[PDB]
Design a protein around this ligand. Sequence first.
Ligand SMILES: C[C@H]1O[C@H](O[C@H]2[C@H](O)[C@@H](O)[C@@H](O)O[C@@H]2CO)[C@H](O)[C@@H](O)[C@@H]1N[C@@H]1[C@H](O)[C@@H](O)[C@H](O[C@H]2O[C@H](CO)[C@@H](O[C@H]3O[C@H](C)[C@@H](N[C@@H]4[C@H](O)[C@@H](O)[C@H](O)[C@]5(CO)O[C@H]45)[C@H](O)[C@H]3O)[C@H](O)[C@H]2O)[C@]2(CO)O[C@H]12
Ligand SMILES: [Ca+2]
Ligand SMILES: [Ca+2]
Length: 684
Amino acid sequence: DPDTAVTNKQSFSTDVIYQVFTDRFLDGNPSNNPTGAAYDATCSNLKLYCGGDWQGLINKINDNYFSDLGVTALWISQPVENIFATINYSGVTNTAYHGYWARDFKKTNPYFGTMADFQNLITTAHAKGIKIVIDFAPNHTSPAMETDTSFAENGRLYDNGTLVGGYTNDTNGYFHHNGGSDFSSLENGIYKNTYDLADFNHNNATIDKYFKDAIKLWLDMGVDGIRVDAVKHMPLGWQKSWMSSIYAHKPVFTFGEWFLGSAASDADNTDFANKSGMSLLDFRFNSAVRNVFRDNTSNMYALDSMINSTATDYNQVNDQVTFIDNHDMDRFKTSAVNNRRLEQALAFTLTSRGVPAIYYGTEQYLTGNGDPDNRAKMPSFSKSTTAFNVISKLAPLRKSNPAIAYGSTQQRWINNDVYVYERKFGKSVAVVAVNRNLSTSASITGLSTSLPTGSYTDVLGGVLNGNNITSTNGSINNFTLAAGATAVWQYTTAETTPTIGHVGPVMGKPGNVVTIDGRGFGSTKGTVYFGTTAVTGAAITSWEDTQIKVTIPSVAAGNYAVKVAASGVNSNAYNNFTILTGDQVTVRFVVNNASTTLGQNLYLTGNVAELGNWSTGSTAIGPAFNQVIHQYPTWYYDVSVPAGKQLEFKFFKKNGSTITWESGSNHTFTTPASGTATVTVNWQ
Ligand SMILES: C[C@H]1O[C@H](O[C@H]2[C@H](O)[C@@H](O)[C@@H](O)O[C@@H]2CO)[C@H](O)[C@@H](O)[C@@H]1N[C@@H]1[C@H](O)[C@@H](O)[C@H](O[C@H]2O[C@H](CO)[C@@H](O[C@H]3O[C@H](C)[C@@H](N[C@@H]4[C@H](O)[C@@H](O)[C@H](O)[C@]5(CO)O[C@H]45)[C@H](O)[C@H]3O)[C@H](O)[C@H]2O)[C@]2(CO)O[C@H]12
Ligand SMILES: [Ca+2]
Ligand SMILES: [Ca+2]
């Protein structure tokens, strides 16, 4: 199967996501709508249910709405059964229409459909060539008041019906009872509740087990991806472990939400994208795009910085999910914001690097500021807007031109209002030109590109005042970029020499299968290389010009580059491939009376790659935590370690450039065969 087929659940660079709020989209079956109290046919009051079910989506896939639009994967609301309670916050009734108030992750939401309607969604969606990504929020259940079982459902969790436990009288400790998080530090936010939400304690083997089993269920149904909610509030140590159990079963493209406010680099968010085993939702990109196009609080140089910076901070910038707006922010379209600016932010987004995502109704210039006005009902299904055109003309390019899916980025011309970037992959090229100034045109002169000699037509057909150009060895003739224009020029040619574009997942135990998508491979099963180690024959399950499928060799856990050899020809390397020692389990390391000075931080390292291999660098584990679960001088950290394995390790303080190890002999610990465990030691 081609890299671009609908069966490629490990890569989305060729796709375009359509994030839909199931409820707010289309009531396709009124028999499932709730009774009275928490239902609104007029869908006037936005906090209550409105209808929108899975059938409506099926109705819309079938009647070709998404096909003429060009989106190739829909990202729906958390499918699990939510709480039926009606919560009343300061006078106003609130319901679980958003899907985030999980109750029992093992069943379907009756208001959205049944297991059978759910299969239908898959089968139908896959038939029309559309992947299904689903939201999943394992950080919590639902709102709950510790001292009041009457308040909502008291975060009660069920296992396919059987009541596991509530928030009050939570003896087994399936949740944290450390009060409300005030978001002052990263750890304050992982171990304390987020809003009034019952926070799960993933160090409880029962919970750890529950979730690994729950997600299995949804994967076995055929979902093509997962959008993990609030990844910023769960331990990376546990999520990594969770993530490897997923990649060991049925690997799908997983990306999580690490909510950021600005476009600036962020240490933690970057360690997460690189070390977790998943990619994030690109909030830095969203700020840039919004500042330049919507808000007008920055210029084009801010875009170029964000492009250059994010490529440097993320091991795979291509796995980040971009978007101009979403359900947790003001809708891009507003009274001041001109229709053309939205159309440009859309063009820019669709042609930029990473997996693009489009919040529903953007193609209809839908507005609404704040939650819940941003989550209004789909006002119409007209396939007539200009925005609809832009999406339907550019979106297919991800599937046709590899420079748009896999390509690198590079500025070719710029000033405060105009940006001209090139996207290239091997011989395939894509130039994009944008003039956000809506009143003054621009005289672009002296512009190089990698478009071979020829005459180029604006792929957009000029819907956005774009023009056609002429190359003479990349040298582009002088031309006037129209006011508010944006044009796209391209060139594409069947690649002959091998070249990798994307690998996924990019983590896993030897024995798993990873997908090496690319071009110019060949029809004859050649040789995959994890660094210096060769792979051939049976180990390679599939081999085509566009996509190889290989079995991770059984070699020393660690970072590795990935090369492919097409008949004596070595390709470019895909760096940062993490190979795990094998099945993972989360483990909480605790250390007593580890006094430290001002600015001095604790870290952890051991005798396996998962711990860094006696490293004190970035492969090390830390800094540790010393506030919520355990208090300073006692530190602690949740880490993903190999299962059933004798381990050695020491802690060390790293204030400035200097290191100081705990003395004596290494601490030892043999990990469980599955689950989680807490290990405590004293600072030697
Ligand atoms: C929403 C977002 O918040 C955090 O993001 C912040 C960044 O961390 C921080 O650096 C800075 O930039 O601010 C950011 C934005 O606030 C988290 O980091 C994100 O993970 C989180 N987003 C996730 C999902 O995208 C989000 O859709 C989802 O939200 C669902 O649940 C919430 C909570 O129930 C719903 O919120 C609305 O309704 C609730 C009931 C309202 N809260 C009540 C009250 O108004 C509030 O002020 C109080 O704190 C109380 C107790 O008195 O909780 C009440 C809230 O004001 C409404 O917005 C939301 O509609 C629903 O979709 C999740 C969980 O699924 O949060 C993630
Ligand atoms: Ca309905
Ligand atoms: Ca948490």
